[PDB]
Curated annotation (Swiss-Prot):
Protein name from the UniProt record: Uncharacterized protein MT2359
Top-rank lineage group of the source organism: Bacteria
UniProt similarity note: To M.leprae U650M.
InterPro entries noted in UniProt: DUF1918 (IPR015035)
Species this protein is from: Mycobacterium tuberculosis (strain CDC 1551 / Oshkosh)
Gene3D superfamilies: Domain of unknown function DUF1918
């Protein structure tokens, strides 16, 4: 996994069915791709530092709106 700033983080379901744990990566605490990350819930509304899980993927704006609402409730429910 390799992270990038200005992009969105996803966890779970690399097979592409259920993509959870969503947010915007504005601060990458890795030079390549290793947790933790400083993440913003944009479509939710808060900043924090979270620990994602396995099957972490990088998405863009559209994958962020709906999916980050639900999947941030998934991600930032704990490990904060």
């Amino acid at each position: 996994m390799h992270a990038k700033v200005g992009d969105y983080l996803v966890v779970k379901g690399t097979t592409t069915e259920r993509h959870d744990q969503h947010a915007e990566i504005i601060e990458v605490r890795s030079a390549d791709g290793s947790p933790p990350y400083v993440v913003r819930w944009l479509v939710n509304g808060h900043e924090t530092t979270v620990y994602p899980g396995s099957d972490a993927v990088v998405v863009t704006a559209t994958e962020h709106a709906e999916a980050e609402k639900r999947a941030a409730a998934r991600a930032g429910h704990a490990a904060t």
